[PDB]
């Protein structure tokens, strides 16, 4: 893994989930959300084969699918973390900004913001902590 | 440059300043600060030679020097951006967290926070926008 | 470009030809050969898009096409360089070894051998020097 | 490890020896040689600390030390492999070419040649197979 791994943003509960591969391209995100981020699932390419990571998190909220077109890639991710109900600190919102459009915000932008603008590099995968919801979130980047 | 380049955090004024090299190790930071971040200067290693980047920014505030010991490296950077006086959006504070201790916060933690926790990788250099102060800030990371 | 670039193997004549991109996957090679290597052409993926490099070299010899399957990647390249006719030093043969099978040798294995076994990494593109034939050859590798 | 790992050149006997670290700079090589390569030892830098790898191999031949100056780095390695005595295939010679001078050849340039010219990158460490002599040899490279 010649990847830079950033994270975690969020809290300490739930369970750590992570990839088992060497991603070079992010092709798809399925995110479940409502008052916070419920779940994440994403597809990546490795040696020309597509692998499905996740679903990580629960089946609450509503689903949205982001299918990146060829030539489309993320240039920034933003989000917010904070309390929800009985959970002290989880991922309340996520926004995915590509070179073509913005996806989100998903969830609700309450709590402490974070932001990852990418001047040079490619976002290729994610990891985090998960229970019924997304407790924490992190990012894998490849040099460009 | 097989480096991941993150940024910019902050505003659009001042002037872009950036490295001209291939850093593999951050050895020293000199930061000037008071109500905000006034200036940045740092030393990096390339092919076993030490290079001095900066000073970028003005000569206001007070100076603090961070000299990393062998075996010491940054595991996270935090900061805040926002208005100062007549400047709409600049870097108000920066905190540098190594595997041994925390340096800062420098400046004042007013405005919008940002945070870059590094789970795998090495911070080796910086860039930004600079006038009399630090208008904007960014980070270079190497896979570990 | 966070790629390791190896080369050149071969001579100093012909004209340098090189990629203008950030390849992350080699999908196809078209090689022209007979007594030496006449030409190279290859396709690579960047941000999910396929780009064609070449053809570099002349229209002599006979053509062979290598189409990598999903999950197939090169683990080694071998070849030979040396004199042919009026050319002091050019690429006489190339062999491409994937995790599934061996392609080649192409050309004739006369002259000085070279070999690039890859223990960890991915070969994603090539460059070289070219006239009527392949004067010289080089390889781009990505960490895996 | 965001390093490209090339190898092995040589035979299948002796015992595999390898680094346990994340090198970013090669500072020193100690090589034992005569009719073949008897042993390798090298120092590398990681997070500003110097670690010694080896000695790998036996105590035959004569010793030579290569101490790289600040700003000096390897641009190519050459060698030869082949039979010697009862050993079917081992490393007969090695030559180390820096941007300032050539070190070697060490050993005897008999057998099958190999060569690793580096157009873009840095050689930061080695591995191999070792018994009384250097059975096999490999190289770690970092993008530059
Ligand atoms: C409802 O509790 C569960 O879900 C939350 C949010 O995912 C976690 O913090 C917690 O550990 C449990 O797994
Ligand atoms: C005081 O004005 C100068 O300094 C500030 C902060 O650096 C910049 O925003 C501005 O463009 C000028 O260079
Ligand atoms: C000897 O001639 C053959 O081999 C050379 C080099 O491969 C080709 O250029 C040529 O067209 C023929 O096919
Ligand atoms: C025949 O002459 C041309 O082709 C050969 C082989 O490619 C080159 O060496 C040379 O510079 C010319 O381009
Ligand atoms: C032929 O003997 C010499 O060369 C071999 C291989 O290099 C060494 O092991 C040995 O000690 C001698 O110096
Ligand atoms: C002499 O026998 C030993 O040394 C040689 C050369 O290193 C190896 O091939 C072999 O496996 C043994 O370790």
Author numbering:
A (entry chain B), B (entry chain B), C (entry chain A), D (entry chain A): 2 to 145
Sentences reproduced from the published study:
In the present work, we present the purification and biochemical characterization of a mJRL from the stem of Ananas comosus (AcmJRL). Size-exclusion chromatography clearly showed that AcmJRL is a homodimeric lectin in solution. AcmJRL adopt the expected β-prism fold with the three characteristic Greek key four-stranded β-sheets (β1–2 + β11–12, β3–6 and β7–10) and all the connecting loops well defined in the electron density. The structure of AcmJRL is the second structure of a mJRL reported with two carbohydrate-binding sites per monomer after BanLec.
Two structures of AcmJRL in complex with D-mannose (AcmJRL:Man) and methyl-α-D-mannopyranoside (AcmJRL:MeαMan) were obtained at 2.75 Å and 1.9 Å respectively. These structures belong to the P6422 space group but with significantly different c axes (257.3 Å and 204.4 Å respectively) indicating different packing. In both cases, the asymmetric unit contains two molecules. They form the side-by-side dimer in AcmJRL:Man and the tail-to-tail dimer in AcmJRL:MeαMan. The overall structures of the AcmJRL:Man and AcmJRL:MeαMan complexes are similar to the AcmJrl structure, with rms deviation between carbon α of the four monomers of 0.75 Å and 0.7 Å respectively. In the AcmJRL:MeαMan complex, a methyl-α-D-mannopyranoside molecule was modeled in each of the two binding-sites 1. The interactions with AcmJRL were all conserved except the hydrogen bond between O5 and the hydroxyl group of Ser133, which rotated 120° as a result of steric hindrance with the methyl group of this ligand. For the binding site 2, a methyl-α-D-mannopyranoside molecule was only modeled in monomer A. The hydrogen bonds between the ligands and the protein in the AcmJRL:Man complex where conserved in the AcmJRL:MeαMan complex, despite a slight rotation of the ligand potentially due to the close proximity of the ligand methyl and the side chain of His36. An extra density is also present in the binding site 2 of monomer B but the quality was not sufficient to properly fit the ligand. This is likely a consequence of an insufficient occupation of this site due to a steric hindrance with the methyl-α-D-mannopyranoside bound in the binding site 1 of a symmetric molecule in the crystal.
